[PDB]
Design a protein around this ligand. Structure first.
Ligand SMILES: [Zn+2]
Ligand SMILES: [Zn+2]
Length: 253
């Protein structure tokens, strides 16, 4: 259209989040927090720019105690400043919300959809099973399921534009989706998002936080079949070790 690859894939830091280490390895005894990366991804494509995930909600800004008084008190502590609000991140990079062709929500956890309300015109691509879940499960914040946004509800695998494929990967959340991207510079890239927080969750199948761990494992299996075929480079969702070698904005892949 004419391109089969994305021009640039940017990894864009969007604040951080403390979680207990047992969230990355369900076998670990709770009591040590890990300061984990929160990411959004920007895709420059022939048809326009696409943003994958939108960071944390404004209620998390300078509010590590956001989850005090809830069922996750002391287990999740967002590390978010004013600068990490998605509109401010976008403006620094060179975009306004209405510039974006699409938003892709991997899932509607607070660390992935907290910014969604900023995008009131752009279509927001989300799995039906995720949208449905967000309407009632208690792990979902109001900020992540605002009623009148321009949702583009999808079911299962989906091609967003040429070069940008969504892979249905439920388990971590009921409608979680991962990304398989073909880039001009790097070729095949698999962004697991939270279908594996870390390399060991994926390769070693170490269990991690999720709504349905059995499902999460089947999704990992499915991803391994794609990997066997495509031999992509693979990036995990909340991996402090891999983060050490990620190329990040203004670098791209
Ligand atoms: Zn998540
Ligand atoms: Zn996450």
């Amino acid at each position: 259209g004419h391109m089969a690859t994305v021009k640039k894939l940017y990894f864009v830091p969007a604040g951080r989040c403390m979680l207990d280490h047992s969230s990355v390895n369900s076998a670990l005894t709770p009591g040590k927090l890990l300061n984990l990366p929160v990411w959004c991804y920007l895709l420059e494509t022939e048809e326009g720019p696409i943003l994958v995930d939108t960071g944390m909600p404004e209620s998390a800004v300078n509010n590590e105690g956001l989850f005090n008084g809830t069922f996750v008190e002391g287990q999740i502590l967002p590390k978010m400043t004013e600068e990490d609000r998605i509109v401010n991140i976008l403006k620094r990079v060179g975009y306004e919300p209405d510039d974006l062709l699409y938003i892709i929500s991997s899932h509607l956890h607070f660390d992935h959809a907290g910014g969604n309300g900023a995008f009131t015109n752009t279509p927001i691509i989300v799995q039906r099973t995720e949208y449905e879940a967000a309407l009632h499960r208690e792990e979902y914040m109001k900020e992540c399921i605002l009623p009148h946004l321009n949702y583009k509800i999808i079911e299962g695998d989906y091609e967003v534009v040429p070069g940008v494929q969504l892979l249905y990967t439920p388990g971590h959340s009921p409608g979680h989706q991962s990304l398989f991207i073909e880039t001009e510079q790097s070729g095949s890239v698999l962004l697991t998002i939270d279908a594996s927080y870390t390399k060991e969750n994926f390769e070693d199948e170490v269990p991690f936080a999720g709504f349905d761990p059995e499902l999460a494992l089947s999704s990992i299996k499915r991803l391994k079949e794609v990997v066997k075929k495509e031999k992509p480079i693979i990036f995990f969702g909340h991996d402090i070790e891999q983060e050490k070698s990620c190329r990040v904005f203004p670098e791209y892949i």
